[PDB]
From a paper:
Ndc80c, a heterotetramer of [name], Nuf2, [name], and [name], is a 600 Å long rod, largely two-chain coiled-coil, with an [name]/Nuf2 globular “head” at one end and an [name]/[name] globular knob at the other. The Mps1 and Aurora B kinases regulate and monitor kinetochore attachment to spindle microtubules during cell division, ultimately ensuring accurate chromosome segregation. We show here, biochemically and structurally, that short peptide segments on both Mps1 and [name] bind the site on the [name]/Nuf2 head of Ndc80c that we have shown previously to bind an [name]-phosphoregulated peptide segment near the C-terminus of Dam147. The Ndc80c head is thus a communication hub for ensuring a robust linkage between centromere and spindle and for integrating the SAC with tension sensing and error correction.
We generated a chimeric construct that fused to the N-terminus of Ndc80cdwarf Nuf2 a peptide containing [name] residues 26–59, with 40–44 (a disordered loop in the AF2 prediction) deleted. The chimera crystallized in space group P43212 (a = b = 115Å, c = 424Å), with two complexes in the asymmetric unit related by an approximate non-crystallographic dyad. We recorded anisotropic diffraction data to a minimum Bragg spacing of 3.9Å, but intensities of reflections in the a* and b* directions fell below significance at Bragg spacings of ~6 Å. When phased only on the molecular-replacement model, a difference map showed strong density for ordered parts of the [name] segment and a structure overall that was consistent with the AF2 prediction between [name] residues 48 and 56. The density for this segment was continuous with that for the Nuf2 subunit of the non-crystallographic-symmetry related complex. Thus, the asymmetric unit is a “domain-swapped” dimer, and the interactions may have been essential for the crystals to form, suggesting that the interaction might occur in solution. Although both sequence alignment and AF2 prediction suggest a potential first part of a bipartite motif, the density map was not continuous enough in the predicted region to build any structure with confidence. The refined conformation of the peptide between residues 50 and 56 (or 76 and 82) is very similar to that of the Mps1 motif, and hence also to the Dam1 peptide, even though the starting point for fitting the peptide was independent of the Mps1 and Dam1 structures. The second-part binding motif, SKIPSP(V/I)R, is present with some variation, in [name]/AuroraB from other point-centromere yeast. The [name] peptide bound more weakly than those from Dam1 and Mps1, but avidity contributed by the two copies of the conserved motif might enhance binding of the intact protein.
Author numbering:
A (entry chain B): 48 to 64, 1007 to 1153, 1407 to 1451
B (entry chain D): 2 to 31, 138 to 220
C (entry chain A): 113 to 318, 621 to 684
D (entry chain C): 6 to 48, 162 to 212
Write the structure that this text describes.
Amino acid sequence: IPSPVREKLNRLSRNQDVFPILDLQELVICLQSCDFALATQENISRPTSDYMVTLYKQIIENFMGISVESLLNSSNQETGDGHLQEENENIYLDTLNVLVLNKICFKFFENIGVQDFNMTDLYKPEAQRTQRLLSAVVNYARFREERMFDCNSFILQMESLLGQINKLNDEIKQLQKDFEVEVKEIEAAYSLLSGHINKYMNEMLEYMQ
Amino acid sequence: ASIDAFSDLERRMDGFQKDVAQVLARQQNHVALYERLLQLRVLPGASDVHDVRFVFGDDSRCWIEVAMHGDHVIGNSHPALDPKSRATLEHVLTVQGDLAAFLVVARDMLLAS
Amino acid sequence: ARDPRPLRDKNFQSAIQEEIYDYLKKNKFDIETNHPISIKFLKQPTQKGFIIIFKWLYLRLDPGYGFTKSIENEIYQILKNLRYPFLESINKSQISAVGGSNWHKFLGMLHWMVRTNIKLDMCLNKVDRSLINQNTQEITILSQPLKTLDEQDQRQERYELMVEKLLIDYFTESYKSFLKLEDNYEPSMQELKLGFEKFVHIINTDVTSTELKLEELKVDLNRKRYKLHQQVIHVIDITSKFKINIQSSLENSENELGNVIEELRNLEFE
Amino acid sequence: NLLDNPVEFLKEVRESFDIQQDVDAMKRIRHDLDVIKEESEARLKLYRSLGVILDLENDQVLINRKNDGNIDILPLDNNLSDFYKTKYIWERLG
């Protein structure tokens, strides 16, 4: 008297894989069209480290709108830690940065259906994992592009309101520029005359002493 | 670019305007004036051997010419005068040697004649 | 490239075992895994218990990593990808039985991981604080009474940054529902509408602020111009009177002296 | 509310000065003083030697032909001078 089995806890694994896997040529065309010029079929098929590090940085800055430099900056708190004693060494640097980059990808991919991003994907990338991850990314980008018309009313309201600031700020800089020019050009007509008057009296004095 | 320093130039205007007034203070003729008050003018003589000619009155009614080079006693008069009037005037320039005395007396003789 | 720490020193091993045990008990090692922790165990360990500790620490550094069936064969590669600064100093032969004489080299690697974990939390706080800083972008420029920056439009680009931060939140959440075969994003949309009203109210502050500042520059320039104009009037008013009086003086002097010279040379009777 | 065009206004002031007119004027004024001075000089010493001294500082005329300063003065103000000043300036002489 045996009992059946629900294999499809792997449907949940397929569920973790709900986003579509894109063919190599289509995946790259879409990635390039998102203005990631660095992405190529050749490099992505044989991923190397220091290439993936550069390429990954470009991707994160676009979808997150942040500065990697600012990221390096925030890792190094200016004051408040360890200032009295150096402990004599520049070590831990970059190692912490490498794990922080790992975390950034991990959190993002959790949001788009990938739960197991890890250091191999960054530092010894492999073809199937690489295309799987990027296909989830593209599907997310397409969803964002596709659904971007949901927010156009907000954009239009924002553009109206931003227009009022700019129009008001344009008037302010125009008015403040025009008055300073007007003042000086009148003063030039007077400044010429002021030198003229000292000159006139000085010549007349030549024949009075 | 000049401004606000006008008080410096204002001082120059007020100073120069009044330096002008000092230099241009109206010098009086002192000769047109003296002739106007006294009806007495000093002109060169017609006969330049006798240098100085004196004209009395508003018109050419009375006049006389005198050398005034040294001991100047020259007889000459538009209203003719007797020798006695001419001798007294000739002594004031000779035995008195006073120009001022000779001048006041001469005009009295001429205007009355 | 060798590790400068004195791993072989036996005094150091005795000291840190007590210090390590206290930390391990506090962070629930003996509870999360059934394996108990003891000073004796940290004195000389078993290989089985070491892998439990290494995996527990590394998952705190790299939670998505999928460990293979025999962790010993990827520890070197893991350190290589991690850019472990002391990789050359660890020989591949002693990973087979770490509990032997060379346990000190592997205690120090584990200890270094603890220090990295400690430092990572500080890093995450700075990232979090950076999030706080991004929480500043939203609120720090707007709480300037008035800002100082080369582009009044840069405040604006910051405003756009403040706005864009809302859509990334909005679309990120909507995408989660889409992948769950869900299509209703009204929860996300209502939250976006409420946040945008805050924006409208706050950017309204700039419109109202800028309008009032603008009306004050108008009044001030008109009055300053009037004051400056009065300065011009005074110069022009007394300059002309100066010149005309001297023109009169010049004219008066010339007529004065011309008539005198005519009289001085008019020796006629007339 | 004022200064319809301050730029033209200032221009007129520079154009109303004219240096050469006044410089030319200065040449003529200095020349005229010399002509009056030089052609009055010989006569002016003759009138000075007469004893007739003139005060224009204080609007009166002094006479010093009696070896004293007690000779009565004649003011220059509020006067006819129409055979008026001349009578006084002939009766005070001797």
